[PDB]
Backbone:
């Protein structure tokens, strides 16, 4: 009667989705063999034994799909829900949005149409794409437009990985990210901005893992998304809906860029020393260090915080801990939202994955905040773009695929519009 | 999927190609009989793996020299199309007379190899800038194929004249005649010089008796490591085109320096550790690169680093950040995060780590300065010209070629200083 | 969803009373509940540590092999 | 619903705190590894079997923190409370208060915030440090500043190991010790002056040992502090909170520099040949010979005396002996405070640390006196200070680190005013 | 954490460093293989431990002197910077022309050794002062690295001209040339003479065949005892900088004296006990210091006594107070309690006590006075000047050097007379 579709386009989102489906199959008892020895939100039934997950795995570079097409989990998916191309986007936009996308996005549309007519109470989409690669940017924009004009009414939530403040794995990041901002604003109703250096620091100081890797980050993101969809999947003493997320967190059609946080991200050793109550966990869930986007919440001003819990919890504990939180002086809200803390409870504790540095623990919180500090992030990225566009750097690589030059300035002013809004709403009366 | 055609040319190109196929064989586990005990080779009925290549030269002696050494049985007996008369190191010999009478069949067999694939991602050339055969027939074949396939990419692993001594006293003329046509129709000009490889195999390995086999083995390791993050899995994969965008900001400034790591002698191998710090230090080491231009005397427009091995990533990113925030002066600042990283999941046979470094810097402009200097000197005296006009070529071309060269460096130095 | 189904852990049987005498406040066993919960979590952490130690030792073994 | 935060900074502070936690974990039946086969003040429950102490150990030289991490109590603490720097303090001030201390102050404040929220009935702090050191003064000053501007009402209890008259372990100690008065007045409420030479002599005469060591030093200090906090932790006919001191010992909030005394400090064989009643013990308490600071109150007056009698002691005997001691001629009070002796009783005796030189005693009395003689100490110290600053000695090692030299005389001005203020309250009206 | 990069220079520095690494390896229980059975050594593949020491010279014979000796195979050959020409005992040779156009490689390897650390604290050099290569390259390296890394500190264990009987005939020249480069670019400079070492080894240990090995052993033991309170636990731990702050009142009065205790012969050890009053009685004795300048002719601006082993700190403090209040003349007054103490918690290998005395006295000025004589008596006749002039040395510099030296000794002369 209700389910979610999750798309994993690109090479980043697809690794995140690999880890995510790993964790999901682990928690619902679904063995990697499909045949198992509350889950209708994710997995459907192919009439016999094996439960097929709802997702499409798009990537033009067929390397990672071949990692999963013959890896440990190839028994699970549908061999048509693994779409691969024969080249890359080479990190530029138009080649993943004008020339090569033209062939593949139509097939993606047909497959998503089939998955839609298969399911009955679909409630939301979840695209998984970094904006660093030309795939996740151009393919992302094109598929987002195609869906927002095909389905429409349904909400959208993109777990998009941006380029970090200072570190990068590509030198042409500011270009093929700004061009996706136009797509992200209109068609992508919400956007759960994720970064890497934040989770890097989290791993480097919380879980004591000195030499982290992409798989650790992906396991953690998988845990976050499981915590998000807990209320839909599992039992709950006090539930929340994926439609209720939107109206509780979208004050205006053009300020909806939300960041996230999760707790307790604590290794085995340190868990031996922690109060473990709801008070300290919803206290640490507000510190800046464990905000999964490298921003400074001490500077901005929150607008609306939703909190999906899990594990045994007495609601009066949540009420008293939120009283203590709102009592803390250094944190401040806007005038037009005196009630900004939405709660939601579920009765499934975290799940452990063999090899996951997360210590098993009953209580767990996951916060998602629409705040106005995130604007600085955008502004930060803006700086990069400046010091490129003055010299038309790398521009011919874009014009060589049918993309008009002026698009860069247009998307630049489009993002300057956001840098105007997100520092216009956080103003007194 | 995403194959690579192996065009050769010149005796240096042929030797380096033989060594490169040797390395690819004992990495992919192909014994020199051609069995296993699509990116490069081609399946062949009977259980053989014939390497997709082509060998061109105006002397059929290199034929027997390359078939004599091991791993020569891999090359099919049909690709060995060779000319008769020989060019004797005369650009016009290998570019106008012998070119226009064998390059026809060269293009024919190249097309035959091309359509046989499904996605010919890019080309691959092994040749020289000095010899008439190598330089001439190579630039002509490159012009022809880039008129043929305007969609694919180009790359030439070219050896250039060493600064101290020269191999063929007319090196400047053939060099400039190859660069006047290469700069227009080529994307990745991986420059190498014999003196840098000499200094590498002596200083950093204590090998007292280097032979061209060993030097070709080093450049083989470099060429392999270039793309090895493609035909293997990896936590972050790249290819021969993500490089091109992460490397060239402009249609001209696309001439790359090359480096490999790790390399150490017998003595110093017991002591030194092996972790991302040491690999980075050898990577950005001045003498470790294979270019006769200390990069410290310029800057980098950009640089990429393809690691290999199942290792961490935070070390990678934090050391990129460190090497960029400490050596910021020697980097250029009008671009953000001017380095690019890539990671694979298989190190070379016999280690647990590797680095292949590629750099689009502004330090080879000095090399082009010295080449233009040599050209002007040996040109104002018309030295060695009646060979270059007795074969249907006017001096006019020569002149304009140097002009083009000027413009080239006229760009590089410029972007070295301009800021915003 | 299936909201309001557990009250971790609750839902007694038919038995009850109409007025207000017993409300299962404190569950009459809250203290033993906390004690057993703490013991269970300590067991969990002990097991996780006992596993992480071996997973680490594997690395030193690999290092000796490489040397 | 009672608790105190025990911040230990510097070097002497952290070793004194190590011995103090030894004594505490001992007397409460706690095992040093944390488990247990009346403690909510210091130790707290850790959600897994054992208990962890309310403490944070700041230091820059990793040697002492490493010794704690590899000593006996490695499992006791929380691996976050042990904040270790990267270099040494080099026995100057600006390198712990202006340039480097800013690296660790914010992390310390976050940890202190965590400890504060994990507690309910806060009552005060207990900072232990020297001032002749480099970080025990600088980082201590910065922490006092940040706390006084962050928490406010909660009163701080400084335990500062000053330089003794003759014994010296540094040549620049007057400089940085004076550099701490500019912040000891403002941000600190109670300051228990502790020297070393007096305690060395104490260990020599009473405990009969002729090779005393810093460990015995810290044992005695730990004993005094445990006898101080017994009232919070335990039973007693006349309990005395930590908000009693402010009302009983602080005439004017600018003169709050108390000095300690303890009894009975007796070896094994020197208790056999004695009686050791309450009268003799309260005579011995006031004897300046076994006072825990270098001062001869015969050349001063007494503003107030808080006495805490732990052990089996009846109150009427205390009242009678108090009458006698106040009736003596050589111990004179000020006129403006006739009723000076505040007294409290606890029904628990001392709990000797195993391996100590002291003897088990059924009774004990710990006196903390706000007196007027301690002033001369400050005066003496200024003497030393001047004989250096008259020739600009070592000023370069401070000006090299942004420390505006004009502060120095200011301190030697401000502290100088202190003396005048004491000459304002010694006025027999 | 808080590492140290040790350097040498000249045969004096190299020999002292050899014996010093021997003593250090003895302390941490290592064998010449370099395996155990961060401050000094570096971990290495297969559990090895390589010293963090750069050795440098222009006479490659001293390498074969130190490498062939025991505890020699440790040092990694990637650090033996040995120019293959020569030095010839001349300052300008080893600082301007010959021993200077090599310093670039030394900087490169020092940078490789430094940027690979986490929190480097200070440099620790050992070298002579009349030795051409030693003094010259030492002061050039000092200038370079101190202009390069000001965040860290500097410490040099120099040796001085043996005052009574010389060892070279041009020692004053190079000695004062080095002095003029030290006071401007250093932060700690301990001085040692090869004369007082003889009087010690002859009247304190009753030796008869003291080879330079044993004297270097004594000096190296002192050097290890200086910084032993950092790599080991301690009731009151010190470091390199705690000295650098508790000692030097002004940025130039930074030339210390070194003393080790205890040191006893056969019978003298048979008779005397090991109790810290005796160690103090032996520590302050003028015949127990490594500097040929009887401190009785001056005072102590300050003196740090670093103990080792295990002892009641009350005994240490009582001995300090008694020796300070009893010899109230030999100490200066305007710095009250001018003696500093420190206690580590590890005795040497084979005792139960240990004492290192690092004393900034105002009595070593006398030594410099004699140099101010010799140089002056070798300049009005322009003796031996043309060799230094033959390398571009401008005599003007020489002049100011002497002038600088003047101020230095003049500084001390202003303070032992100061009253308050
Ligand atoms: N946190 C996290 N980031 C990832 C992961 N995998 C890839 N990324 C990031 O993906 C970004 C690159 O964008 P991609 O879309 O993956 O590059 P691409 O797929 O090669 O793009 P084209 O080949 O040109 O189509 C890099 O910044 C990676 O850090 C992952 O598993 N976890
Ligand atoms: N009562 C007591 N005093 C101590 C103890 N340990 C050190 N001290 C005092 O510490 C003072 C030395 O200054 P330090 O605290 O060590 O210097 P610092 O501020 O910590 O800076 P660094 O030690 O260099 O990192 C001496 O005066 C000692 O009296 C101890 O265990 N007990
Ligand atoms: N590193 C390397 N360089 C080579 C080798 N063989 C030739 N070269 C260079 O090849 C250059 C001559 O170009 P080439 O076209 O091969 O001569 P041609 O055959 O007479 O036309 C010379 O500068 C040689 O130094 C080799 O085996 N290894
Ligand atoms: N105690 C000791 N002193 C040495 C040693 N080697 C050299 N010296 C001193 O070195 C001084 C001569 O200068 P030197 O550095 O050896 O000349 P250079 O090395 O050729 O530049 C002499 O005064 C010697 O006293 C040694 O091994 N032990
Ligand atoms: Mg891709
Ligand atoms: Mg300190």
Residues:
């Amino acid at each position: 009667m209700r389910e979610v579709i999750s798309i994993h386009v690109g090479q980043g989102g697809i690794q995140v989705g690999n880890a995510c489906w790993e964790l999901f199959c682990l928690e619902h008892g679904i063995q990697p063999d499909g045949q198992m020895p509350a889950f209708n939100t994710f997995f459907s039934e192919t009439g016999a034994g094996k439960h097929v997950p709802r997702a499409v795995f798009l990537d033009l570079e067929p390397t990672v799909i071949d990692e999963v097409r013959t890896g440990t989990y190839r028994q699970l998916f549908h061999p048509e829900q693994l779409i691969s191309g024969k080249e890359d986007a080479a990190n530029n936009f138009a080649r993943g949005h004008y020339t090569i996308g033209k062939e593949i996005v139509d097939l993606c549309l047909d497959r998503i149409r089939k998955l839609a007519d298969n399911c009955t109470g679909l409630q939301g989409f979840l695209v998984f794409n970094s904006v660093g690669g030309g795939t996740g940017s151009g393919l992302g924009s094109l598929l987002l437009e195609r869906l927002s004009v095909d389905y429409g009414k349904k909400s959208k939530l993109g777990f998009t990985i941006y380029p970090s403040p200072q570190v990068s794995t590509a030198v042409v990041e500011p270009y093929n990210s700004i061009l996706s901002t136009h797509s992200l604003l209109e068609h992508t109703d919400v956007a759960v901005m994720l970064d890497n250096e934040a989770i890097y620091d989290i791993c480097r100081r919380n879980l004591d893992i000195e030499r982290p890797t992409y798989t650790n980050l992906n396991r953690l993101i998988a845990q976050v998304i499981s915590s998000l969809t807990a209320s839909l999947r599992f039992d709950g003493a006090l539930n929340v809906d994926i439609t209720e997320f939107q109206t509780n967190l979208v004050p205006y059609p053009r300020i909806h860029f939300m960041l996230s946080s999760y707790a307790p991200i604590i290794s085995a050793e340190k868990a031996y020393h922690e109060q473990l109550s709801v008070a300290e966990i919803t206290n640490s869930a507000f510190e800046p260090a464990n905000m999964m986007a490298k921003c400074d919440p001490r500077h901005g001003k929150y607008m609306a915080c939703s909190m999906m819990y899990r594990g045994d919890v007495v609601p009066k504990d949540v009420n008293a801990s939120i009283a203590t939180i709102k009592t803390k002086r250094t944190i401040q809200f806007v005038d037009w939202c005196p009630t900004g803390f939405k709660v939601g409870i579920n009765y499934q504790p975290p799940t452990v994955v063999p090899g996951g540095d997360l210590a098993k623990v009953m209580r767990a919180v996951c916060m998602i905040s629409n705040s106005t500090a995130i604007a600085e992030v955008f502004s930060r990225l803006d700086h990069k773009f400046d010091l490129m566009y003055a010299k038309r750097a790398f521009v011919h690589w874009y014009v060589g695929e049918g993309m008009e030059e002026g698009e860069f300035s247009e998307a630049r002013e489009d993002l300057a519009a956001l840098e105007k809004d997100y520092e216009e709403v956080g103003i007194e009366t | 999927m995403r194959e690579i055609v192996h065009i050769q040319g010149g005796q240096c190109g042929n030797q380096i190609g033989a060594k490169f196929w040797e390395v690819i064989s004992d990495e992919h586990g192909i014994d020199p009989t051609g069995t296993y005990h699509n990116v490069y080779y081609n399946e062949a009925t009977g259980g053989r793996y014939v390497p997709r290549a082509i060998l061109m030269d105006l002397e059929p002696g290199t034929m027997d020299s390359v078939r004599a050494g091991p791993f020569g049985q891999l090359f099919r007996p049909d690709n060995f199309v060779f000319g008769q008369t020989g060019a004797g190191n005369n650009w016009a010999k290998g570019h106008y007379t012998e070119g226009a009478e064998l390059i026809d069949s060269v293009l024919d067999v190249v097309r035959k190899e091309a359509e046989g694939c499904d996605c010919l991602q890019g080309f691959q050339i092994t040749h020289s800038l000095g010899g008439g055969t190598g330089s001439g027939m190579g630039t002509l074949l490159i012009s022809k194929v880039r008129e043929e396939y305007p969609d694919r990419i180009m790359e030439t692993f070219s050896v250039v004249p060493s600064p101290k001594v020269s191999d063929t006293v007319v090196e400047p003329y053939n060099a400039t005649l190859s660069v006047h046509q290469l700069v227009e129709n080529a994307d990745e000009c991986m420059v190498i010089d014999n003196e840098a490889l000499y200094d590498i195999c002596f200083r950093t390995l204590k090998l007292t008796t280097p032979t061209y086999g060993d030097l070709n083995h080093l450049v083989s390791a470099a060429m392999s490591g270039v793309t090895c993050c493609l035909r293997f899995p990896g936590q972050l994969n790249s290819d021969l085109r993500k490089l091109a965008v992460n490397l060239i900001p402009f249609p001209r400034l696309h001439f790359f320096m090359i480096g490999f790591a790790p390399l150490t002698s017998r003595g110093s191998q017991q002591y030194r550790a092996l972790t991302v710090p040491e690999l980075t230090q050898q990577m950005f080491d001045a003498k470790n690169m294979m270019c006769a231009a200390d990069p410290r005397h310029g800057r980098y427009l950009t640089a990429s680093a393809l690691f290999r091995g199942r290792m961490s990533t935070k070390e990678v990113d934090e050391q990129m950040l460190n090497v960029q925030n400490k050596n910021s002066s020697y980097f250029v600042e009008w671009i953000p995060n001017n380095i690019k990283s890539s990671i694979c999941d298989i190190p070379p046979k016999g280690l647990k780590m590797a680095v292949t470094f590629v750099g689009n810097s502004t330090a080879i402009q000095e090399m082009f300065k010295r080449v233009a200097e040599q050209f002007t000197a040996m040109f104002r005296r018309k030295a060695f010209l009646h060979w270059y006009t007795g074969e249907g070529m006017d001096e006019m071309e020569f002149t304009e070629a140097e002009s083009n060269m000027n413009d080239l460096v006229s760009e590089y130095q410029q972007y070295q200083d301009a800021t915003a | 969803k299936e909201s309001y189904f557990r009250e971790h852990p609750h839902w007694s049987d038919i038995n009850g009373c109409s007025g207000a005498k017993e409300f299962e406040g404190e569950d009459l066993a809250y203290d033993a509940r906390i004690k057993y919960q703490k013991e269970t979590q300590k067991q969990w952490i002990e097991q996780q540590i006992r596993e992480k130690k071996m997973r680490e030792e594997a690395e030193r073994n690999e290092e000796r092999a490489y040397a």
